[PDB]
Amino acid sequence: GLFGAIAGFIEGGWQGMVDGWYGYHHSNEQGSGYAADKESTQKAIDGVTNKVNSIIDKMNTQFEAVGREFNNLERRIENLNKKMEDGFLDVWTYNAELLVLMENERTLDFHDSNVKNLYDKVRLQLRDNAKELGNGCFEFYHKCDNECMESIRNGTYNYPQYSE
């Protein structure tokens, strides 16, 4: 993990979060549950789908492979044709594989980055009014109903509160 988030300081993933990729787990006086962060998840899906389609669109003008015949005394240009189509085959195969690997990495670090950024979106909302447990959770110093939870989810967290 490049950013330390996925499989780092956040040691694991949520099997119980099924409504998207990212989200929150709340546990207050009105029950406990997993919610999925809409807009970040969406922007991620946009990123990766647009990425796949980008990769495809970048390889619609590849190399064809027409077959050519040569006689018993045209061994040279036959060899040339072979060597050259085989050549292009090698280069485009290389391009596809390498691009795929690179963008796989870029993708994983992309998800990692999104998790990091969410964690900071919430952390900067709850300055003193919450404590870092360390494992990716924020513990409340006050009692926080489902509406405060939602205000943190949609970003409309009303900070004006005590803490001791």
């Binding site: 064809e64 085959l89 485009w92 596809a96 926080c144």
Partner: protein, 321 residues
Amino acid sequence: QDQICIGYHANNSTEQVDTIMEKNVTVTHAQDILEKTHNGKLCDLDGVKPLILRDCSVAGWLLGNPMCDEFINVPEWSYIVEKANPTNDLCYPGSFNDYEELKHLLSRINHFEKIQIIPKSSWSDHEASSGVSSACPYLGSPSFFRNVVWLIKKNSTYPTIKKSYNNTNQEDLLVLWGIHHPNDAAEQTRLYQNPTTYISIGTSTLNQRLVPKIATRSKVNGQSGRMEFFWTILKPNDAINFESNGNFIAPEYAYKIVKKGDSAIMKSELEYGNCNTKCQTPMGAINSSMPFHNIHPLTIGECPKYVKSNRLVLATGLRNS
């Protein structure tokens, strides 16, 4: 006390991907973009069936090899399938000038229609009904190429021939003819009285003068003699002119190129399955939305891009455990 937690999705998937720094990385979601499966059949290409020569080559087909009478009248095709080693090619030994260059022409043609441009009955002053050999047996009797006619002397005399054909059609004409190289002078005289023979051929652009090459050669299909075939593409309104005093294997049937277009010639041992595809390889057809495949380079139709890889998986989901 209340609390709130940040985390990420996990699930029950085993799909692995590979990165530059780490291989076989397990993820929640992944997308294969590599098509690795074919049907093992040669199918129709967009509804129109390909011409599949069985054990026939293009030479044997077009020259009218008797053993190729399966293809005397071939309809419009999508692509052409020839085996690697057609058993039926030049039943009578010899050669085909610019053969590969003609095969290349076939890649831009979807339909010939054979037409008699010179009737066999028209040779009043020669024999056109004795041009046979045991090197081309049809049904256990000595025969020959159907599209051309092997003239020989009549009443101990082979008069000079001045035969011509004006392409009055609006289509291009593939015209084929040949020369017979005997193996001794006695044979040359025996078939075509004149000892020193030739065949002159002219069009708008064509200006050639063949002479036979008498020479001692080994037996191919029981004959030491050879046939050498030549071709040309007659334009509409253009005419072809033959003058010869011997060894002349004359045209009889020619092919009207009535439908041009993007076609191809496949090499494949496979035979026709009764299917239909938008993409065809020599080892099977493809039906996939996949952008890549690793079946065969030589591909025809509306197809994915060929790639040498054994495995290409793109990572859609995140890191799982």
